[PDB]
Amino acid sequence: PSDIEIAQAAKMKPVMELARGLGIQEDEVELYGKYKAKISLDVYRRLKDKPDGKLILVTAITPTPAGEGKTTTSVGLTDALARLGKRVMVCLREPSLGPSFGIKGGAAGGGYAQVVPMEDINLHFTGDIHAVTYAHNLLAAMVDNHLQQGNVLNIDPRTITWRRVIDLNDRALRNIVIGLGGKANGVPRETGFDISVASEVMACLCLASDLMDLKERFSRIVVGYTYDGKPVTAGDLEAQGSMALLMKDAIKPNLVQTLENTPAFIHGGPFANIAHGCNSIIATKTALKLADYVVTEAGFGADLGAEKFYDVKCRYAGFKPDATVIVATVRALKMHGGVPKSDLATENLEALREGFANLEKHIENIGKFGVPAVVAINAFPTDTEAELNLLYELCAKAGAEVALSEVWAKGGEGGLELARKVLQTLESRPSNFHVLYNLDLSIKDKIAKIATEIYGADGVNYTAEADKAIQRYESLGYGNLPVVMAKTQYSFSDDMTKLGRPRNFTITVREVRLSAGAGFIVPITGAIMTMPGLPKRPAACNIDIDADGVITGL
């Protein structure tokens, strides 16, 4: 039964009620209708010295374009725990608007494991991405006005790294020339747009602890350089105050719920292939005051999202994840064993056997961070009973804790086996969380650490552009920043072609960006683009709404 059919038929508690059931007081809630709200940052502030609940991360194997089921699983696990009577919350990322009209669709879950109101969540929600987009683009506009008004600071406009942003898959704005028409109309220069969720401004939102912090980070954002190579910042242009203003509400996290009325925060939405892939620190640390157990997702596979959750988010938050759930699927493991994407509804026992190496490696990789894993087998409607025991069997045989999850088709009661297993590991195998690398290393050493330890490459190559940039950033004193790698989600390699556990290969960084405001560095690898495109048949064509109800949203 279609995801929007059942999302629209849902039966929701007023969120003011859920809020109150969490120790949040009426005047700390700001409603966006009965079913959505924003929680004050005073909640976390007044509880600063109270103990945390347990932190549970969900990550996954290397996906197909439709995705496996982190979100779908995160929601379900949360519903299952609520059904064992636990005081639990999910933290998730706000879905990017753009992909609802292209390809992979929304990010509110699936079947009976969803967050709702789904169509709000997937579209405009509470206006957060819009606030990111306007602060980002206001800065750009100010940069461009500056050039026009005599270029007082002597910016070399051919070095401006600050791009524009919009929350759509618009490939035609990747590379553009701007400022044309003559002397009344700006200064010609080459730029383009990224998708808003990849904005550094969203990164700042996701790492900041409150408005004034966000304002200070904004002011350290570097937009470009003078003709003599001195950096020029958003604070040099006095933009941070306006930028902060535009984020005045977006800083607060959003409360919705699951289909079974369990509470859920949704806040910040960076992708994990081209950004840091986590929800806001603010959401997650607030939730940890409010619930005994907090489930949260990192984007794409564990080589990307899980790695950056540990090495960036946890680092900057002081978080100590207690357990980690790895989502695996028969569909995907078969793909990693040879089966084409068009033949996956077919049984193939060997292609799951030789596809397993993929998961083998993700488990290995999680183990390196010292937090105990449980595998979740997200049973797809087509997966045969035989394929399903083999995977169970392979996970046990590898030593790993496992559980089948029928959360998609059955909701929270599809996730009891799994929920017990997570509870089992919280109670019986404590976590020993530590980062992969220290901050005092070179940029190139940190990159090589991730390259070799996680993706399993032999080493890393640099274009001259990249080398020039790394020099620049260490010499300017940003050498201590952590690394958010941009790379394809479809492989451990930077070649989207290398399925499974590719061996004897090299990653090539072509471009290096600096996020001095969010406080990390972004080495861009392979051919990954920072603005995605629409397909031949965009979801949009099938999308509609009548005197009430909507179709084509997924």
Ligand X SMILES: Nc1ncnc2c1ncn2[C@@H]1O[C@H](COP(=O)(O)OP(=O)(O)O)[C@@H](O)[C@H]1O
Is 474 annotated as ligand-binding? no
Question: With contact defined as beta carbons under 8 Å apart, do 294 and 53 qualify?
Answer: yes
Compute the least distance from the CB of residue 507 to ligand X, in Å: 23
- SS3 (DSSP) at 293: strand
By a kind-dependent CB cut-off of 5 to 8 A, residue 187 interacts, out of its own copies, ligand X, Mg ion, none, with its own copies
Give yes or no: 70 in active site.
yes
Question: With contact defined as beta carbons under 8 Å apart, do 371 and 322 qualify?
Answer: yes
CA distances from 469 to 68, 512, 524 (A): 36, 6, 12
Q: Residue ranges of the alpha helices (H) in 484-554?
A: none
Does 117 bind its own copies (CB under 8 A)? Our answer is no
Catalytic residue, chosen from 380, 466, 488, 498, is 380
Interacting stretch for its own copies, rule CB under 8 A, among 79-87, 178-186, 296-304, 339-347?
A: 178-186
The binding track of 390-419 with respect to ligand X, each residue x by CB under 6 A or -, is: ------------------x-----------
Does 338 bind its own copies (CB under 8 A)? Our answer is no
Nearer to ligand X, 316 or 408 (CB): 408
By a kind-dependent CB cut-off of 5 to 8 A, residue 316 interacts, out of Mg ion, ligand X, its own copies, none, with none
> Where in 79-108 is the site for Mg ion (CB under 5 A)?
107
Compute the least distance from the CB of residue 58 to ligand X, in Å: 8
Catalytic residue, chosen from 36, 38, 60, 72, is 72
452: nearest Cα among 360, 512, 368, 328:
368
DSSP 440: T
Sequence-distant (≥ 6) Cβ neighbours of residue 258 within 8 angstroms: 75, 78, 79, 90, 113, 114, 115, 116, 264, 412
Choice from 32, 265, 380, 462 touching ligand X (CB under 6 A): 380
Nearer to ligand X, 5 or 393 (CB): 5
Residue 263 CA, chain-centre distance (Å), reads 20
CA distances from 492 to 331, 457, 534 (A): 18, 8, 24
Choice from 107, 426, 447, 522 touching ligand X (CB under 6 A): 107
Choice from 44, 68, 112, 294 touching ligand X (CB under 6 A): 68
Is 239 annotated as ligand-binding? no
Using CA atoms, how far apart are residues 469 and 439, in angstroms rounded to an integer? 19
Give yes or no: 162 in active site.
no
By a kind-dependent CB cut-off of 5 to 8 A, residue 381 interacts, out of ligand X, Mg ion, its own copies, none, with ligand X
Using CA atoms, how far apart are residues 94 and 266, in angstroms rounded to an integer? 6
The binding track of 1-20 with respect to ligand X, each residue x by CB under 6 A or -, is: --x-x---------------
Catalytic residue, chosen from 19, 203, 272, 457, is 272
At CA 73, angle to CA 256 and CA 60, rounded to 5? 125
- What amino acid occupies position 382? T
Residue 264 CA, chain-centre distance (Å), reads 16
Give yes or no: 93 in active site.
yes
Nearer to its own copies, 88 or 132 (CB): 132
Catalytic residue, chosen from 36, 54, 93, 308, is 93
Is 82 annotated as ligand-binding? no
Q: How many CB atoms lie within 10 A of CB 475?
A: 10
Give yes or no: 83 in active site.
no
313: nearest Cα among 126, 91, 470, 24:
91
Using CA atoms, how far apart are residues 488 and 296, in angstroms rounded to an integer? 22
Is 291 annotated as ligand-binding? no
Nearer to its own copies, 247 or 295 (CB): 247
At CA 87, angle to CA 84 and CA 91, rounded to 5? 110
Q: Which residue number is nearest to ligand X in terms of Cβ?
A: 110
Annotated binding site for ATP: 64-71
Tell me which residues touch Mg ion (CB under 5 A).
70-71, 107
